[PDB]
């Protein structure tokens, strides 16, 4: 398997790991802060997904310093992972077009 496909797969697995770890850590960081809502694991996982995809509905979000640092890691991991898939798709099209041109 070519590099871009392997890297894409790896990025997906790493993203799932970041989502799970981020969910666990977000609850750890937010409980103890009066008013915080990102405090149970099921909704924290949902929050991690809508954060990684950059949707950000606003139904849930961190209010503490550490919860926000966790959020930044989730954001960057999501953007980087989806960006890498785009890059892999571009490489695929580039390779195919070269062929179609006889190269």
């Amino acid at each position, epitope marked *: 398997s070519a590099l871009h496909w392997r890297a894409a797969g790896a990025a997906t697995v790493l993203l799932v790991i970041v989502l799970l770890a981020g969910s*666990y850590l977000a*609850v*750890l960081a*937010e*409980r*103890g*802060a*009066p*008013g*915080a*809502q990102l*405090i*149970t*694991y*099921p909704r924290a996982l949902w929050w991690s997904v809508e954060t990684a995809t950059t949707v950000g509905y606003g139904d849930l979000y961190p209010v503490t310093l550490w919860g926000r640092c966790v959020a930044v890691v989730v954001m960057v991991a999501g953007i980087t992972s989806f960006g890498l898939v785009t890059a892999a798709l571009a490489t695929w099209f580039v390779g195919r077009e070269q062929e179609r041109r006889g190269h």
Partner: antibody
Amino acid sequence: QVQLQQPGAELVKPGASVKLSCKASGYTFTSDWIHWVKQRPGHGLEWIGEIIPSYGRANYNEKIQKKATLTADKSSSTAFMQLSSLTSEDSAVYYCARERGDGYFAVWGAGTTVTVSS
Amino acid sequence: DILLTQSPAILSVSPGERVSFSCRASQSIGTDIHWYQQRTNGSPRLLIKYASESISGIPSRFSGSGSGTDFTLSINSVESEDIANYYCQQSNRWPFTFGSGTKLEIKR
């Protein structure tokens, strides 16, 4: 089988401290939190604090004077609540309860009756 | 912190009659409300979770409803064993808080 085991009672002289225990059995997850609740005779339930054994962090009710310090021993699956410098105001039943990180207390211990008297 | 108001503090019903306990939150908490039963000298016992979800082992007689700020715990056809104190508890925001409790009294 009993998921949370707590000693029946503890007599404490005013000013002294005591360490309550809560031995847990059954399924255990990294997402479990052990809570402590205080209930004076004839009164309601008051949340004291919580601790996550897998990490060891504890949080406390800010609305009340802090009398407790929570710890947990992973190898013995036991959670502890150290109550210090007690007065008769601290006399009550202290329950421990388990929450699977999803907001509700799935199960409660039988409670430890603490009496502060000379 | 979220204040949970349970009023009336005492509810008197006749045998076999349907009863409803009230729980009002100081602010909207979605369906993050749970109900517990505590008999004399007993420890609290979970009856309903997330406002209306059944717990295995609890009689079908028990049900819950509501969302937002107003919640209800209902018992269809009350019987002696239901005599106890009932508490609501929220988990929408930190810290978790408890309502002050409602006692069920039966007029036989």
